[PDB]
């Protein structure tokens, strides 16, 4: 079934227990405390040297040099806003300050992650004109480009990419900003398997993820197995959680040495990431984490506003076309001209590269459409049996093997009937998605992991396929198809 944390290979890593890592990155320390009463019962092995403490494991938090207990207590107030929560405390014998991050896993007590504090700095001069740029963005393109720039300006990382996941989970490098001279990944695709489902749920549970040095030596928890459960400690909510050797090897092959990844979550779904990559090990100021979180919420809000604006654009193009015909039939005794271009493109309310109208044995086409004999082959298949108000597919060959030769122009077809005579259709097209990008290639083993190979593994799945048809896509064909039909019954 599911391989334990350090132990997967390329064939079973989907199910690797990355949330049960059993270890942390060396630049912090992790205590596990029981409740109530707050006895340290599990600790990262580096805890004593890291925190300047004699012993750790088994000693009550009250008895640890320096105010940590006192600093967590106000956040266990039933009525407080509570966990996850950050605190600043002093710990240890040569006493020093730490930023603590406390949360409660569903099982195992209280987890407290510690890192060395620096002096307090105020980053709020950053989020305000950034907030204005985000809320001001005119399009998804513009917003993601500005978000790559913005994240590069406030993080200083060598490369920032904003990925965007599609219906199936696959990633597109949708925006990129990098220091001149690096190679570009802008426009690359990767298969959804490059990011395991559990990694995806982890990006929803915490919104900032940090790797300071791709070369670190994991520091194990002791005892490892939680004494309260006899099982591995749920580490979903741990900022210091080690990172899978699989992905570390991926970064090593890419040249990359550090990583600051921020989650974009839209309507409760992981929508993409803002990935910051550095070609050097890289520490960050604690106050940079809240900045990322605030920024990613603004972005996610804007994306919602854009998708929603796009929505009513469609619903407009529609009820603003019942009229492109109403009259444009008064003089010029036929409606078709309204269908085809006129810059009210029948092609974009569905994001298609081609459209055809088959009506009374007359076939007209804009964009990239199969041969007119080929439209007829499709019309012949639509008439083979009774259909829904809309019929669609994003893998025409394979769904309909005899139509395989149409993969090029028409892996994706959506058809809507326009009467009952039938043989009469409004038909939209999309090419095999391979033709929406090109570049790629190669083989398999952790040493072979790379963007190049990922772009190739992507072309391989996806093979007999177009961009999938969305709900909105189908709603549009639905309602467009309908109002044409309504108005053909007219005359």
Ligand X SMILES: */C=C/C1=C(C)C(=O)N/C1=C\C1=NC(=C\c2[nH]c(/C=C3/NC(=O)C(C=C)=C3C)c(C)c2CCC(=O)O)/C(CCC(=O)O)=C1C
Binding stretches for ligand X (CB under 6 A): 10, 13-14, 18, 163, 171, 173, 185, 188, 190, 194-196, 199, 209, 243-244, 246-247, 250, 259, 261, 273, 275, 449, 451, 454
Tell me how far, at minimum, the Cβ of 454 lies from ligand X, in Å. 3
Residue 173 vs 418, nearer CB to ligand X: 173
Residue 201 vs 320, nearer CB to ligand X: 201
Tell me how far, at minimum, the Cβ of 98 lies from ligand X, in Å. 23
CA distances from 482 to 195, 318, 319, 478 (A): 40, 10, 11, 6
- The count of residues in the chain is 491
Tell me how far, at minimum, the Cβ of 160 lies from ligand X, in Å. 10
Please give the distance of CA 354 from its chain centroid, rounded to a whole number. Answer: 29
CA distances from 301 to 84, 134, 267, 271, 297 (A): 22, 9, 9, 12, 6
Tell me how far, at minimum, the Cβ of 119 lies from ligand X, in Å. 29
Residue whose CB is nearest to ligand X in the complex, by number: 13
| Bridge partner residues of 88 (DSSP) | 99
Determine the straight-line distance between the first and last CA of the chain, rounded to whole angstroms: 63
Tell me how far, at minimum, the Cβ of 1 lies from ligand X, in Å. 15
| Bridge partner residues of 87 (DSSP) | 100
Tell me how far, at minimum, the Cβ of 147 lies from ligand X, in Å. 14
Residue 171 vs 354, nearer CB to ligand X: 171
Residue 112 vs 246, nearer CB to ligand X: 246
Backbone angles phi, psi at 197, to 5 degrees: -50, -45
Residue 98 vs 250, nearer CB to ligand X: 250
Tell me how far, at minimum, the Cβ of 233 lies from ligand X, in Å. 16
Both tokens of residue 17? 């227990």
Residue 218 vs 451, nearer CB to ligand X: 451
Tell me how far, at minimum, the Cβ of 340 lies from ligand X, in Å. 39
How would DSSP label each residue in 102-144? EE--SSSSEEEEEEE-------TTTTTHHHHHHHH--SHHHHH
Dihedral sign computed on CA atoms, order 368, 374, 378, 380: positive
Both tokens of residue 401? 């093997």
Residue 201 vs 231, nearer CB to ligand X: 201
Residue 247 vs 282, nearer CB to ligand X: 247
149 and 161 Cβ atoms separated by less than 8 Å: no
Both tokens of residue 481? 């198809």
Dihedral sign computed on CA atoms, order 376, 378, 381, 387: negative
DSSP state of 155: H
Tell me how far, at minimum, the Cβ of 412 lies from ligand X, in Å. 24
Cα 488 to Cα 483: distance, rounded to the nearest angstrom: 9
Cα 74 to Cα 68: distance, rounded to the nearest angstrom: 11
Residue 18 vs 87, nearer CB to ligand X: 18
């Amino acid at each position: 079934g599911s391989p334990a944390f350090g132990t997967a290979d390329l064939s079973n890593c989907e199910r690797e227990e990355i949330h049960l890592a059993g270890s942390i990155q060396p630049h912090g320390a992790l205590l596990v405390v029981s409740e109530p009463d707050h006895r340290i019962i599990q600790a990262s092995a580096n805890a004593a040297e890291f925190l300047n403490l004699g012993s750790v494991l088994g000693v009550p938090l009250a008895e640890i040099d320096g105010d940590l207990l006192i600093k967590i207590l106000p956040h266990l107030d039933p009525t407080a806003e509570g966990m996850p929560v950050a605190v600043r405390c002093r710990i240890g014998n040569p006493s020093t300050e730490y930023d603590g991050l406390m949360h409660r896993p569903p099982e195992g007590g209280l987890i407290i992650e510690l890192e060395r504090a620096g002096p307090p700095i105020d980053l709020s001069g950053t989020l305000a004109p950034a907030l204005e740029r985000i809320r001001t963005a005119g399009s998804l393109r513009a917003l993601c480009d500005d978000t790559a720039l913005l994240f590069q300006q406030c993080t200083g990382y060598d490369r920032v990419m904003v990925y965007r996941f599609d219906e199936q989970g696959h990633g597109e490098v949708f925006s990129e900003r990098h220091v001149p001279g690096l190679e570009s990944y802008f426009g690359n695709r990767y298969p959804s398997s490059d990011i395991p489902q559990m990694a995806r749920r982890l990006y929803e549970r915490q919104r900032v993820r940090v790797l300071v040095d791709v070369s670190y030596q994991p520091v194990p928890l002791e005892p490892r197995l939680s004494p309260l459960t006899g099982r591995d400690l749920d580490m979903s909510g741990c900022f210091l959680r080690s990172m899978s050797p699989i992905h570390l090897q991926y970064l090593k092959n890419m040249g990359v040495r550090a990583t600051l990844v921020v989650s974009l979550v839209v309507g409760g779904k992981l929508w993409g990431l803002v990935a910051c990559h550095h070609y050097l090990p890289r520490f960050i100021h604690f106050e940079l984490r809240a900045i990322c979180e605030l920024l990613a919420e603004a972005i996610a809000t804007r994306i919602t506003a854009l998708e929603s604006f796009a929505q009513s654009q469609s619903e407009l193009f529609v009820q603003r076309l019942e009229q492109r015909m109403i009259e444009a039939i008064t003089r010029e005794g036929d409606w078709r001209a309204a269908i085809f271009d006129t810059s009210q493109s029948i092609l974009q309310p569905l994001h298609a590269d081609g459209c055809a109208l088959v009506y009374e044995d007359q076939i007209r086409t804009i964009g990239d459409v199969p041969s007119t004999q080929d439209v007829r082959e499709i019309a012949g298949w639509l008439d083979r049996q009774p259909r829904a108000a809309v019929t669609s597919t994003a893998s025409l060959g394979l769904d309909v093997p005899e139509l395989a030769h149409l993969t090029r122009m028409a892996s994706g077809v959506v058809a809507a009937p326009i009467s009952d005579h039938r043989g009469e259709f409004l038909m939209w097209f999309r090419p095999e998605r391979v033709h929406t990008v090109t570049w790629g290639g190669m083989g398999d083993t952790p040493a072979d992991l790379s963007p190049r190979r990922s772009f190739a593994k992507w072309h391989q799945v996806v093979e007999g396929t177009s961009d999938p048809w969305t709900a909105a896509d189908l709603a549009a064909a639905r309602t467009i198809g309908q109002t044409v039909a309504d108005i053909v019954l007219q005359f």
